[PDB]
């Protein structure tokens, strides 16, 4: 729960020098929420289109949105799409997609009603992964080594070794990019090895793809996904558009499915309808509409890629102006990994008692929202910087 209850703590002011480095939402240099221009544009288009009703969308969701979302992840020229072996199920954000997928694997994968199948999540991972799959009824939820605290980066040989020792068919939850919370992603060459182990041992890739856009480049961010496609994997991918469209509170996501033949997608999609029918009946519209219109229209599309760049660039800027500021000033070590990490979230270094004092970025692990730094919010986050570090 933590992050949506460090949202309540943002108020507990010692010197009215609080800090939310807590919630995962982009914040401008003036520490405000940023509605994208493309969005404020498209919203008007909707509100000025009197042809639109509010009749029930299909269970699986808006057609146009489902196409555009899957196409964004797999690429316009994907062999999957061209061989009509790709489905998509509008969801209530990435959390919606994940749950729906979790529920489906629990009911239809590795045999029937198989809750014994091992589920694998990065060590560490997003606080909500363990819970989502527990809810879907999986009993065995396991770690794969990922964050090497010592080398402050990817433990590739531990990861691979763990995938090597996973029972055949085990499910594997992968961060498509912008690993949360640590901010280290595999290189393509690192992906190529992981895929190899997963291919030999028939492991199931379940991608989590909540921050497509945040190298700043959407095609770049989707390379891992698109490689697994080209290597002939079957997989799910939980897409969220909460960050890359700023539609947090319209709950816009999509569970893309990749199969070996069209008939699989048909079987699979039809069984998803039952799950949706007893979870939320059918999805909300405003979200999906805003996205569907943006991606389907070349004019708006281009402008949107700009707006994601904008956010992506400010995050790098705030990264530089605090690492590089550890070249002149020092106290313990120095260290590259702030500007090494990518995504929205940094893994700093800290212990649990620094975090208690600190200023207040209270994610015990030491994870901060980089977007939550500003010049005014003092690029000097730790103020002098190493008084709570020294
Ligand atoms: C990997 C990952 N997936 C999904 C989400 C949640 O997005 P939403 O609430 O729109 O599903 C987050 C939030 O930080 C995340 O880090």
From Swiss-Prot:
Catalytic activities: L-aspartate + 2-oxoglutarate = oxaloacetate + L-glutamate; L-cysteine + 2-oxoglutarate = 2-oxo-3-sulfanylpropanoate + L-glutamate; (2S)-2-aminobutanoate + 2-oxoglutarate = 2-oxobutanoate + L-glutamate; 3-sulfino-L-alanine + 2-oxoglutarate = 3-sulfinopyruvate + L-glutamate
Localization annotation: Cytoplasm
EC number(s) from the headed UniProt entry: 2.6.1.1, 2.6.1.3
Predominant place of localization: cytoplasm
GO molecular function: carboxylic acid binding; L-aspartate:2-oxoglutarate aminotransferase activity; L-cysteine transaminase activity; phosphatidylserine decarboxylase activity; pyridoxal phosphate binding
Listed SUPFAM superfamilies: PLP-dependent transferases
Cofactor(s) in the UniProt record: pyridoxal 5'-phosphate
A GO CC term attached to the entry: axon terminus
Keyword Amino-acid biosynthesis: yes
Modified residues (N6-(pyridoxal phosphate)lysine): 243
InterPro entries given in the database record: Aminotransferase_I/II_large (IPR004839), Asp_trans (IPR000796), NHTrfase_class1_PyrdxlP-BS (IPR004838), PyrdxlP-dep_Trfase (IPR015424), PyrdxlP-dep_Trfase_major (IPR015421), PyrdxlP-dep_Trfase_small (IPR015422)
Biological role: Biosynthesis of L-glutamate from L-aspartate or L-cysteine. Important regulator of levels of glutamate, the major excitatory neurotransmitter of the vertebrate central nervous system. Acts as a scavenger of glutamate in brain neuroprotection. The aspartate aminotransferase activity is involved in hepatic glucose synthesis during development and in adipocyte glyceroneogenesis. Using L-cysteine as substrate, regulates levels of mercaptopyruvate, an important source of hydrogen sulfide. Mercaptopyruvate is converted into H(2)S via the action of 3-mercaptopyruvate sulfurtransferase (3MST).
Note: In eukaryotes there are cytoplasmic, mitochondrial and chloroplastic isozymes. Aspartate aminotransferase activity found to be increased in cerebral spinal fluid (CSF) of patients with Alzheimer disease. Fetal serum levels of the enzyme in the umbilical artery and vein are found to be significantly higher than maternal serum levels.
The protein's name: Aspartate aminotransferase, cytoplasmic
Gene of this entry: GOT1
């Amino acid at each position: 729960v933590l992050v949506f209850k460090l949202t309540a703590d943002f108020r507990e002011d010692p010197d009215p020098r609080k800090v939310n480095l807590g919630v995962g939402a982009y914040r401008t240099d003036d520490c405000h929420p940023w509605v994208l221009p493309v969005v404020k544009k498209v919203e008007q288009k909707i509100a000025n289109d009197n042809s639109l009703n509010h009749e029930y969308l299909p269970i699986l969701g808006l057609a146009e949105f489902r196409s555009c979302a899957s196409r964004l992840a797999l690429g316009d020229d994907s062999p999957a799409l061209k061989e009509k072996r790709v489905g998509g199920v509008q969801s209530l954000g990435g959390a919606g997609a994940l749950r729906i997928g979790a529920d489906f694997l629990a009911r239809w994968y590795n045999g029937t009603n198989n809750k014994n199948t091992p589920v694998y999540v990065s060590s560490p991972t997003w606080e909500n992964h363990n819970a989502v799959f527990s809810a879907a009824g999986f009993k065995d939820i396991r770690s794969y080594r990922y964050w090497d605290a010592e080398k402050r980066g990817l433990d590739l040989q531990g990861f691979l070794n763990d995938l090597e020792n996973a029972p055949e068919f085990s499910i594997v939850v992968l961060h498509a990019c912008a690993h949360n919370p640590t901010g280290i992603d595999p290189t393509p060459e690192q992906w190529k090895q992981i895929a190899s182990v997963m291919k030999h041992r028939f492991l199931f890739p379940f991608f989590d793809s909540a921050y497509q856009g945040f190298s700043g480049n959407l095609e770049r961010d989707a390379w891992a996904i698109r490689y697994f496609v080209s290597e002939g994997f079957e997989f799910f991918c939980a897409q969220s558009f909460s960050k890359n469209f700023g539609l947090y509170n319209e709950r816009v996501g999509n569970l893309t499915v990749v199969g070996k033949e069209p008939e699989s997608i048909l079987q699979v999609l039809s069984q998803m309808e039952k799950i949706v029918r007893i979870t939320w009946s059918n999805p909300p519209a405003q979200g999906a509409r805003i996205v569907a219109s943006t991606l389907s229209n070349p004019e708006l599309f281009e402008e949107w890629t700009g707006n994601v760049k904008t956010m992506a660039d400010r995050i790098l800027t705030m990264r530089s102006e605090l690492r590089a500021r550890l070249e002149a000033l020092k106290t313990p070590g120095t260290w590259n990994h702030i500007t090494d990490q990518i995504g929205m979230f940094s893994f700093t270094g800290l212990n649990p008692k620094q975090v208690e004092y600190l200023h207040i970025y209270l994610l015990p692990s030491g994870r901060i929202n980089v977007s939550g730094l500003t010049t005014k919010n003092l690029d000097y986050v730790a103020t002098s910087i190493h008084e709570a570090v020294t």
